Amino acid sequence: SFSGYLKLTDNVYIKNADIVEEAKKVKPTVVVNAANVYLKHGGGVAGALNKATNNAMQVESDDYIATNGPLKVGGSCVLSGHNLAKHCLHVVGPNVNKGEDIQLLKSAYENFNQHEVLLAPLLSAGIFGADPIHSLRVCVDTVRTNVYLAVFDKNLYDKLVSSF
Ligand SMILES: O=C(N[C@H](C(=O)O)c1ccc2c(c1)CCO2)c1ncnc2[nH]ccc12
């Protein structure tokens, strides 16, 4: 049900799209959220996905943290996808704006290998402060399962394709 994606490798595909609109159209088994360790979904991809769920993602996430404590940077958890997907895989990439180690970006993408197919953003890009060209290279060199990457910004999408 994914359509309009450019093939980068055997298993990695990319499109200039809003991940919320893509999730509402496709209703994938797994949508990846660019989470933080507290699952506080304020801005970027996380804020946008949570708003689309009418805040149900944040209510579920607060119950998960009250039971389990915070995630690790490079870690993940599987929660409901609400009206966007069967499941949401909340993955914590390092936030360079908060001083976190960029080497944890490969550990963050390894979480994707537990799922056959995923709709995802580029981890640690955008407001997390890492170079998106580096994030796409770590994705293609780490993930072995089928990943459909949605890049919201048109100008960044064009730069990622021409420099790949
Ligand atoms: O990475 C950028 N955008 C992506 C995207 O468009 O999907 C994006 C945006 C938000 C976000 C994530 C990724 C993951 C956490 O929230 C981006 N766009 C515009 N100017 C920029 N300068 C440096 C990077 C950058």
What is residue 91's three-state secondary structure? strand
What does the angle CA 117 – CA 119 – CA 125 come to, to the nearest 5 degrees? 125
Structure tokens of 110? Answer: 């390894």
Pairing of strands 87-91, 30-34: parallel
Buried b (16+ CB within 10 A) or exposed e, 86-113: ebbbbbbbbbeeeebebebbebbbebbe
Task: Write the CATH number of the domain with boundaries 6-161.
Answer: 3.40.220.10
**Is residue 148 within a helix (H) or strand (E), and if so which, with residue range?**
strand 146-151
Q: How far away, in angstroms, is 6 Cα from ligand 1 center?
A: 19
SS3 of 104-137: HHHHHHHHHHHCCEEEECCCCCHHHCCCHHHHHH
Pocket test for ligand 1, best of 40, 98, 156 (most atoms within 8 A of CB): 156
Which residue carries 């990943």 as its tokens? 147
